[PDB]
Design a protein around this ligand. Structure first.
Ligand SMILES: Cc1cc2c(cc1C)N(C[C@H](O)[C@H](O)[C@H](O)COP(=O)(O)OP(=O)(O)OC[C@H]1O[C@@H](n3cnc4c(N)ncnc43)[C@H](O)[C@@H]1O)c1[nH]c(=O)[nH]c(=O)c1N2
Ligand SMILES: Cc1cc2c(cc1C)N(C[C@H](O)[C@H](O)[C@H](O)COP(=O)(O)OP(=O)(O)OC[C@H]1O[C@@H](n3cnc4c(N)ncnc43)[C@H](O)[C@@H]1O)c1[nH]c(=O)[nH]c(=O)c1N2
Ligand SMILES: CC(=O)NCCCC[C@H](N)C(=O)O
Ligand SMILES: CC(=O)NCCCC[C@H](N)C(=O)O
Lengths: 531, 536
């Protein structure tokens, strides 16, 4: 008995942590020379301790916790418990979702304001009537999403699935088609009892999410509202960057027997050695070597599995369709090392102090979102590193064309666009920011063979039609699909952890069910249902 | 008309070149500004240096569903008549060669759910195991999709023939639907099908998408599904391609524009700003900053893709709030192509692992594997040196998004991974072993139009609501009437040359209407009375 774990991201590392706690031998096979996957911290050459940024995961909306690292029940309790398990609870530092001093900026339709100032951003000229403006995007979206989200939250608290059944009755909607064809405003709003026009729906998307978000599944909008805590959370980040979490797990696993890492070994084939024999082991071809396992837990992204030879893994027809159709979404980030944290200490072209500490600014310009660092802000050397752009969906697709070209001329075009946008958002001259620029690092998760997308971002119907097929094993029960796509917390670490819980659960169920009581005791009786 | 009229045309793609052709025909001065060192834009022919005359492939436009034409190049009315008459205007009508949409010999292959068949053999591709009932299988995807799309498409075709807009107005009443949401919430099968009068399940809709289009197509606007059915001719056409590759068309236009020795293009000059010199002056000229130089024009016709305009400083172009939203929200789609030079046209002369001849000449094969579509060359097939070059993969939507991560990485290890995946997929589709194809491989060229700064996407592919809400705003000029938006996005023929041409007609029409209406009769006579409405 020995489990092959494919991928040393947080899903594979957590699977390994569970198996080691239950004395199950395993091996982790990793294509690259690094552990952590989409926990990827870039530290700028020649910068200080806090001159890094997180290219992937960077913020954790955790439940409240006590002095000992005991977490209240909640959506991300499993992440919190993982930090505590590893002795990391005291290395968690505040993440400021909003600025800890003056509010961040909003810059839309050429109108600049602070978050909370109640600007309408010229929406009357767009044809948004004053009644809608007075209610506001947040309240409108909450009225539509809230009923679904409350039922799913009740499922988690009460250990039911009726909320999910109702969500699936509505899973053929995109957020857009929900607003266009089903949603009617609460009568308390005093609005006409008719579906919103596309102009109004596009106004909602502009201020609620990212360009194109509303054409993906309604269910994803509901689940992400739950994940972001809108249904209190302690926002945290990891001192030194998210890489500390996978590095800490790998260091622990390396100090112990029953396991080993196989690095720099890309998987090219997965299948039963002999599919007609009931006791057949699994074979994984990685780095040109055949390795044999009793069972395999894959944490490879679904589009990556589509590049692997799965002949003799005996996927059923729904599973093989799911690998292709279950939809992924794109994302880019651009980090800039400056000479000083000008957003904290500087002033705009008219002498007005920005006075920003952590938090975010938002704009309809191509950069879309700016994230000021929360790490290091009270130390003797605050971060000089900015997340100058963080984009999703169409905004990320478009920006990705300027990233990773290898050509100086496009690198210069990209820098000039980003600085020009930043200048407009903050009301500075371009040269103010250029004079302070040191170094630029950019990343496109949709131009990366190890991810082939940033993360799962399902279209309408995906959850109701294809998702469950991959929670069944393949390969006569010996191939288990995991990774964040196999969760209802897409684009979160907790999604990867939940998928690992379910894969090990199934593995134990079919091979050694006497270990189930200890598995439940250490890692929970359920993946998602609250403690 | 001011003595100093001069139109700045941004972009030397087919839209900008056609704009210049129209203006030249009307004696209106112009200048073309192009970021790159080449003309043609998304008409992009890659020639393999180690190959023969027909060892090229078209990385962008490659096939033209034209109306029937006579011996002199007069085209019947039809969706792509404007393209046909452009060929004839340029003396190219006789350089058009057949494009085989289906194989000219034995049928192409389909490989879905591990089941291989020839096109036309009636396989169900294991659909019963997917839960597709026998009634749906017997009807078939094509008939079902035609039943849903047909009424919209017929009303739009009537618009073109009868010179009305009621078909479009009715389409716009339904533009908030994606193809998926139309099937899930509105479409009911024709009574003649004998099916339950219920909306299709997601499982069934995903089966339609699998065989009809590309992964994720149905989450874009229903209107695009209708418009592309019109464009592909499912509402007959002469499929043509250009001998030597699509590059011949823009090359021929450039040569025509240069024939008097003038109309020098401004090359290697990327536009970074467009705006009025003084937006508070009514007679203000336009200023274009390109290659670090300011250039002044009376009017500007932009053929830059919308995501490109979002990287240009449009301060002082005075876009209204709808137009500036449109630049961001009007959706683009991705595409990739992979061309492979082989030692021989094994698809024509070779045999599979059981000795069965492929016997393919032109045409296409289809699969749910990552490569999705294989296109066999139609050019050169009857000559003494047929093409040895294959389009081994041509993908859209999610399939293109995923494959793009393996393209242009700059890393030998990923180039090798890509080649092995493509050859493995080809072997499964055609029933060969991998080594059969590897033994015949010479060179690989791959291209991702969604990782290309000059396009920032393959082409417009609007989401639901885009046409009804935002499209018309960019058909109005900006910059006090002096900035005209064009390029294929500004059409109802997205991802076709005719869309770029229509957009150029409309931009020049508006320019003439506001600056020199005495040229309208000659403009109509040479280039048509309407952009789209049919004429003899
Ligand atoms: C831009 C962005 C932003 C965020 C986030 C992601 C991204 C991309 N997330 C989500 C979070 O990062 C993500 O859900 C998990 O890290 C995914 O972990 P997995 O183990 O599922 O996959 P992951 O992709 O991390 O790991 C897979 C592993 O497989 C390897 N591999 C790939 N192909 C292989 C092959 N052929 N053979 C062998 N190995 C192969 C890879 O190299 C990698 O190590 C997040 N979460 C959160 O909690 N807070 C946040 O703020 C964010 N924000
Ligand atoms: C993969 C694929 C496949 C097909 C097609 C496209 C693609 C991508 N098409 C569609 C067809 O190729 C397309 O609609 C037109 O060529 C677009 O012409 P435009 O002039 O609108 O833009 P196009 O993008 O061609 O031209 C714009 C020009 O602007 C330049 N430029 C960009 N940024 C600039 C800047 N900042 N400053 C200055 N210049 C700048 C570019 O370099 C380019 O020359 C097609 N059509 C068809 O009829 N049949 C087919 O078979 C196909 N198939
Ligand atoms: C499916 C999807 O796009 N989710 C986005 C939700 C947030 C992404 C990431 N966790 C963040 O905090 O930005
Ligand atoms: C908007 C869109 O995706 N259109 C696709 C239609 C066909 C693309 C191209 N003209 C071809 O012939 O492949």
């Amino acid at each position: 008995e020995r489990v092959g774990i494919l991928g040393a991201g947080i899903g594979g590392l957590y699977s390994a942590l569970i198996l080691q706690s239950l004395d199950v031998p395993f091996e982790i096979i990793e294509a690259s020379n690094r552990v952590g996957g989409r926990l990827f911290t870039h530290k700028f050459p020649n910068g200080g301790k806090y001159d890094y940024y997180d290219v992937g995961a960077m913020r954790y909306p955790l439940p409240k916790s006590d002095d000992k690292g005991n977490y209240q029940p909640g959506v991300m309790q499993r992440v919190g418990q993982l930090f505590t398990y590893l002795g990391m609870h005291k290395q968690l530092i505040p993440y400021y979702f909003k600025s800890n001093k003056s509010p961040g900026f909003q810059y839309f339709n050429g109108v600049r304001a602070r978050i909370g100032e109640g600007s309408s951003f010229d929406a009357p000229a767009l044809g948004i009537n004053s009644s809608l403006i007075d209610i506001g995007v947040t309240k409108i979206v909450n009225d539509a999403v809230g009923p679904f989200a409350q039922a799913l939250f009740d499922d988690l608290q009460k250990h039911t699935t009726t909320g999910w059944d109702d969500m699936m009755k509505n899973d053929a909607y995109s957020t857009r088609s929900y607003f266009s064809f089903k949603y009617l405003p609460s009568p308390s709003f005093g609005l006409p009892s008719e579906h919103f026009s596309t102009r109004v729906i596009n106004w909602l998307e502009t201020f609620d999410k990212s360009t194109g978000w509303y054409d993906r599944g309604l269910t994803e909008t509901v689940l992400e509202a739950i994940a972001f805590g809108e249904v209190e959370v302690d926002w945290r980040c990891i001192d030194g960057g998210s890489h500390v979490l996978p590095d800490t797990i790998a260091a622990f696993l390396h100090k112990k027997g029953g396991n080993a890492f196989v690095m720099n070994a890309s998987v090219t084939a997965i299948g039963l050695e002999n599919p007609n024999k009931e006791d057949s082991p699994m074979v994984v071809v990685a780095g040109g070597q055949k390795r044999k396992y009793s069972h395999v837990i894959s944490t490879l992204p679904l589009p990556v599995l589509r590049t692997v030879d799965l002949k003799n893994s005996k996927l059923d027809i729904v599973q093989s369709n799911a690998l292709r159709k279950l939809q992924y979404g794109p994302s880019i980030k651009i980090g800039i090392l400056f000479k000083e944290p000008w957003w904290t200490t500087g002033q705009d072209k008219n002498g007005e102090k920005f006075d920003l500490v952590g938090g975010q600014s938002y704009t309809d310009l191509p950069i879309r979102t700016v994230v000021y660092p929360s790490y290091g802000v009270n130390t003797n050397a605050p971060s000089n590193t900015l997340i100058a752009s963080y984009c999703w969906t169409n905004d990320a697709e478009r920006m990705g064309s300027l990233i990773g070209t290898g050509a100086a001329t496009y690198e210069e075009q990209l820098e000039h666009l980003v600085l020009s946008n930043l200048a407009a958002v903050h009301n500075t001259d371009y040269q103010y920011l250029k004079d302070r620029l040191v170094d630029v690092h950019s990343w496109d998760w949709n131009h990366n063979p190890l991810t082939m997308g940033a993360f799962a971002f399902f279209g309408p119907g995906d959850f109701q039609d294809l998702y469950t097929s991959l929670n069944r094993p393949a390969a006569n029960g010996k191939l288990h699909f995991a990774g964040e796509a196999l969760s209802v917390r897409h684009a979160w670490v907790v999604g990867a952890l939940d998928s690992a819980w379910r894969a090990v659960y199934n593995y134990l169920y079919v091979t050694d069910p006497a270990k189930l009581p200890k598995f439940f005791e250490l890692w929970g009786k359920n993946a998602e249902w609250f403690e």
